Structure formats: C-alpha cells, structure tokens
Write a protein that binds this ligand. Structure first.
Ligand SMILES: C[C@@](O)(CCOP(=O)(O)OP(=O)(O)O)CC(=O)O
Ligand SMILES: C[C@@](O)(CCOP(=O)(O)OP(=O)(O)O)CC(=O)O
Lengths: 403, 403
C-alpha cells in the first residue's frame, strides 16, 4: 500500500457568548432552544491549532489533544467525521502525484493532532475552538464545497458553541426550525473591525471545585428548571434583537445591560436546576460588584461582564483607556501569589499591560491575595485561518504521527 | 394628670418560609404576588419578647429595641399603630381603678420595649417575630375583639412575614384578591404537634458582606427580574397545593423536593435581578452540597434546606436520629474557631447536642475552620403567648420606661 500523506493545519479562535446558549431541543443534532450571539476573540493565548492528515497507510482514525491520544469513539467526534466525510470530494495534489477519488474517502482513515493554547486546568471552552478547527481543517483537506455557514452546521454537531467560531467578529447562531437541523447555523453579524475599540479581559479564577459540564448541566436544566422555558420563549428572542441593534450601532450601554443581565439570568437558570448548579463563586461575585460599582461611579457604563460554565470572569471594556484603568484596578483588588512574575500573571496584548488614587475611587477595597490565577487581555478577532508554514504543523509530514 | 400604667408582655416566635414570599403588588398595604407557607419555630434562642404600656402621663409614642430607643416615625410602625388603635375598645382594670374609654385611645400614647433573642449581627428576621409581637401584645392591651387571623392582617402591614407568626405549626399567608387587603391573612394549616418529629438546625454563617434588605431587594426584583412574574403566576400556586398535601400527610420526600427547590428558585430570582442580589455565599453552597450528597447516600431524603435573605442555612431533619447524625456531620465539616466552648457553638434543645466513620460516609471532606459562627437547634413551635410573670416585663411597672 501507498504511503503519501496529505495534511492541513488550521488555527481557530474561541468565542464568548453575550446572549447565552443553554438547553437543547435535540441532543443528537445539537439544536438549541434559543438563538445565541457571541464575540470571536483574537487568537493569542486563546486559539486552538489543529493538523489533520490522511494516508492510505493509516489503519485507524486517531486523534491527539495536547500530546495525549484520545478516543474518537464518542458521538460528537463520530458525528462530525461522518458529516464532513459525506461531503468530501475529489482531491488532487499534482506535485506529489496524489489523486483521491470521492469514493476513496469512505475508507481513508485520518490522523488529527490538536493543541489548545488556553491552559487546560484554567477553564476555557476548549470544545468550541476545537470542533470548529477540526471541521474547518477537514473541509480544506477533503475539498468540501461549502461556505462557512454550512460548515457551521457540521461543527455544531461536535459542540453547539463551536459553530459560532467559524466567523470573526460578532456571530449569531440561529436556532433554526427544521427537524433536520439544516438551518441551525451561524452567521456573521459584523466583522472584527466594526467595533475594534472593545478590549476584553478574562480573569481566570482560582477554584478546585470541578464544574458540571455544560452538556450535562444544560440537560439537567431542560429537565428540571421551571424558569428555562420562559427564558427561551419570552426573554431571549427580544434580547437577540436588541443585541443585534446594539452591535450595529455600537451602543455600549445597551450592550452592557444585555450582556450582564443575560449572563446573570443563565446563572439563575442554573440555580433553579435540581440539583442546583453553581458555576460562579465568591470571587466571581466580587468581580461583578467591582464592575457594578465602577460603572455607577462613572455615570455611563464603561465595563460589561459575562460568565460561562465556570467562575472565570469575562470583562469587556468600552475602549482602551478604560482597559488600562481597569487592569490597574484589578491588580489592586486581586494582588498575586507571593513572588509572581507579572509577565506570567497578565498575558495578552502588550501595549495595555505596560501602563493611582483616582482609580481607588472606583473600586474601593482590596481583597485577599491570590483569588485570581491570572488575567488575559484580548480583542474581537477574525475567524479561522489555514497555516501554510509547515513548521507549525503538529503531525510529522512523513509518519503522520505527532511531532 | 393621672399616672397609672397598664402594660402587657408577650412572647412571639419567629417563622421560616418553606414556600417563599418575594415581591409585593402593594407597597403600602403589603400584599404579596403569591401565597407563602412557613413553619413557626420553638421560641428558644429565636423568639422576640415585647412589653407594651399605656399611661396618660406618656407625652410621646416611644419604642426601645434591645436597649436602644428607635424611631416609630416610619410607615411600618405608623401603619400597625394606626390599625390596631382604630380597633381599640373599652378597657377596665377594677383592682387598679382604671377605666379607658374607647375614645381615650385616640390620645393615649404608648411605650414599647422589645428584645430579640436572636443575636443582632447574626442575621435572623427580627422583623417577623417583632411586628407580630407588637400587634399581638397591643391587641391584648387595647381589648381588640379580633381573632389571630384578623390580627394577622395588621401585623402584615408591619412586615409581610410577620403575619405568619400569629400561629404555631405550619402557616399559610394567603395572597388575597381584595384591594383593601382584608383577605390577605395567615391561617394555620396544622399545629406544632402534627409533625413533631421534625428537627431544625440553623447554621449562622460567618459573613461581613452586608445584605440587601428583603424589602428593597424584592422591590428591585419586581422591577427588574423577568422570571419573577412567571414564578408567581405559574410555579408557586402549584407548589402551595403540593406543600399543603405534603404537610397534611407528612410526606417528607415531597416536602424536601419543594423546600429545596423553592429556596433555590427564590435565589435564582435574586440573581436575575438587576443589579443581581447574592444572598448565599460559598459556605451556603457547601452546605447545600453536603445536604444533597447526604440525601443521595441515604436513598430516601433525610434533610431539607432553605435560605432566606442571607447566607444562613436552615436545615430540616426528618427526625431526631437524623438530627444527631447531621449535627456530628456538621461539626466535622465546620470545625469551630480555635478555643471555642461547644456550649456556645451549638445552642438549642440539649438532648440532641449531648450525642464516627459511618457518618464520614455521607459528607466526605472537611472544610477550613470557622466558616460557621454557630448552630441553633429548634423544632416546630406553638404561636405567641402572653407572659403573666411581671419579672419578665421589659418596662418598669411605674415609670413605663425600660428596666
Ligand atoms: C454556557 C455556554 O458556554 C454554553 C456552552 O455549551 P457547549 O457548547 O459546551 O455545549 P454542547 O453543545 O453540549 O457541546 C454559553 C454559550 O457558549 O452560549
Ligand atoms: C426572603 C423572605 O424571608 C422574605 C422576607 O420578607 P419581609 O417580610 O422581611 O419583607 P417586608 O414585607 O417588606 O417587611 C421569604 C419569606 O419569609 O417568605
């Protein structure tokens, strides 16, 4: 048998919902009970990088995540692979003498290696950027003839939030109304330049509490929370329309009202679940109080917050001057562990990190030390991209096994 | 002018809602948006003791709470005084030569002194037992001809939860539907003997966070929480009927499902408020996790929890053997501050306090020290009573001023 190896490497950003996805109506096709809207983040310290490879000499589909092999046996990987394979087409690399016929893909096995630049015990959705990257890279590999919105639908079957990482900027996942899920897809609302002033600051919060997974948790809520249905039918459709308008016109005050309140309502549904799900901790509450105080002592709002399925705070600053104030604010309230290199305790961006009483005004009181593990600054970012520089591939170009 | 002094002293227990009151439809008459149901606790370490006095020589209405004079100027005191005075009748103490004509009450001023046996910075509703006691004692003083249910309605105007402390046992506050509030009253569901097996354990949790008041908080929720209306119209009416049946038939499993879930849903509405209200802290969550684990590792439920407008946990044990296990459980997970007299760290009851691996089974892991300030054990209790023993009066029988 032949031993050529075709591979593709892609880099895919993560995203952060400002109007939240919580609860499915279909556990197999992954269709949600409401729309959601998110912001794609800049790749640095947040993206997932993935290399996919096909060879007639691979005996098995196999996958590696951050160095360790893992199972593709599960339904989420099995459904993406199946859907993308079924759309594979003729490929031909003439320089290398390789012709793959459409039918060949029914038997060619795949090797996938993937790397998450978010620290793994830090707590950010690895799944979102990850299934989006897999789908996007495989779609290049197999010459699938489909736009990002249709590819959205495949990524969605690996993880619901993954479908929103196929575009940059601000992205809407439409819940769709067809049974087959074909219209449950993401679409870009605006690109990453429309609102380039926003700066994002993630507080990765210390906690050893292991968090109920988003998939199980939201299933539990659909099954036991008597408030979720009312959220889904009567609250979120309206919030979707207001958030669209707020993004269109960069109304940061409307954007702040919506983001904070939809995050809080999502955590309210989690508390109304039986047994209750507690994703925020006392540090989380302390960050919200800081943000709400800071905004009251500045009249018009300067900072929004949102929280996913954990205590990590995501803060969104109206612009860079706010970001610089806030970052000194946050360092006062969340001083580090003793002997801590500030190069390690505040990742991202560079210019803002390199940069005071009038701030003590807006925050008030200092906290105990080390409630925060570290901060990450970022920005709205573009969508996924292919990497042509093979130095960045994670599979060996000849063995098809992890470097 | 004359200088006789007529006084009455009464002792009134506090109560604990298992189906929660949260939100008014009338801020003046204090009418709620849903029914509520509570359990009256045994008086020890929980009651409020009040002495009321009238004399022609008092120039002013005045009141003392735990030693300190306070203002009666506010609407809550002004509305109770006004309502009870308007129902005053002819009084006559023949031994002392005192005749009070109905009309005299329009001019006689009152002295009130009151004492809360809950520590004041501990965090229990002083208001509930307090306005109930005031109304109950004044109703005796002024010879009002009204049953506890009608007196309920007056206490309600001092504090909504106060109306439920006019009966022992399990008590329902009916939301009523008349504009004048006359049918918004409490009624006893069963007395304190019907379910005498229940043991109650209150964890008074350490926290310096000052809590948003119940009155302001629930106003904020009515104004900003989009889930509250659905709770009030569609969740609670059904829970009221199930909780009635569960109390009637001492179904502790149904009672546990309802109590935990209605407490959690109340805190969910608080989180859905803008700005959010956080009454539970990380200690609170740790107690819920202990209770949920303990119940799973015992099959049928043995312990219910509920939380009011603060982090204090109220636990309700199916019976005394459970209570004794749990209390050793709680001491393992919440060890005291160093050098702490266990006579001070666990109040109440006596027999159960005086009373182990097989329990390590049900709780798991130990916590840091001093997360709990102290525990209080109690039981379902009777309603308010008059004290005839003048040694217990808080006003001096001749000056009408605080001892
Ligand atoms: C709380 C959220 O982050 C939900 C994340 O859900 P997942 O995308 O992880 O769930 P599955 O579809 O089961 O894979 C809010 C959001 O991203 O919208
Ligand atoms: C959370 C609760 O304890 C509400 C207490 O409310 P208050 O009775 O204190 O409020 P006001 O009527 O304004 O005086 C739940 C309950 O007791 O039902």
């Amino acid at each position: 048998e032949e031993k050529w190896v075709v591979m593709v490497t892609a880099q895919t950003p993560t995203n952060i919902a400002v109007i939240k996805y919580w609860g499915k109506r279909d556990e197999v096709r992954i269709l949600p009970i409401n729309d959601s809207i998110s912001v794609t983040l800049d790749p640095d310290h947040l993206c997932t990088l993935t290399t996919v490879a096909v060879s007639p000499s691979f005996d098995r589909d196999r996958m590696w995540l951050n160095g360790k092999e893992i199972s593709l046996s599960g339904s989420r990987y099995q459904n993406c692979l199946r859907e993308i394979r079924s759309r594979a087409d003729d490929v031909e690399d003439k320089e290398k003498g390789i012709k793959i016929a459409k039918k060949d893909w029914e038997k060619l096995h795949l090797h996938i290696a993937s790397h998450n630049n978010f620290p793994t015990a830090a707590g950010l959705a690895s799944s979102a950027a990850g299934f989006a990257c897999l789908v996007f890279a495989l779609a290049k590999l197999m010459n699938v003839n489909e736009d990002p919105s249709q590819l959205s639908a495949i990524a969605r079957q690996g993880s619901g939030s993954a479908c929103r990482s196929l575009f940059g900027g601000f992205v809407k996942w439409n819940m769709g109304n067809k049974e087959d899920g074909s219209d449950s897809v993401a679409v870009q609302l605006v690109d990453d330049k429309h609102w380039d002033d926003l700066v994002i600051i993630i507080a990765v919060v210390s906690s050893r509490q292991k968090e109920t997974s988003s998939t199980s948790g939201m299933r539990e809520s659909v099954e036991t929370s008597l408030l979720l249905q009312h959220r889904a039918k009567e609250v979120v459709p309206v919030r979707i329309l207001q958030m669209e308008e707020a993004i269109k016109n960069r109304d940061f005050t409307s954007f702040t009202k919506l983001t904070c309140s939809d995050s809080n309502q999502f955590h309210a549904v989690c508390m109304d679940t039986s047994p209750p799900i507690f994703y925020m901790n006392d540090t989380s509450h302390r960050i919200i109080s800081l943000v709400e105080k800071w905004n009251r002592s500045a009249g018009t709002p300067e900072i929004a917050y949102t929280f996913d399925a954990g205590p990590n705070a995501v803060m969104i600053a109206r612009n860079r001057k706010v970001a610089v104030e806030l970052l000194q604010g946050l360092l006062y309230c969340f001083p580090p562990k003793p002997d801590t290199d500030m190069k390690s305790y505040v990742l991202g961006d560079t210019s803002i990190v390199k940069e005071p009483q009038g701030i003590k005004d807006k925050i008030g009181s200092q906290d105990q030390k080390g409630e925060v593990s570290y901060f990450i600054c970022s920005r709205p970012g573009r969508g996924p991209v292919v990497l042509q520089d093979q130095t960045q591939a994670l599979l060996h170009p000849q063995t098809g096994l992890p470097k």
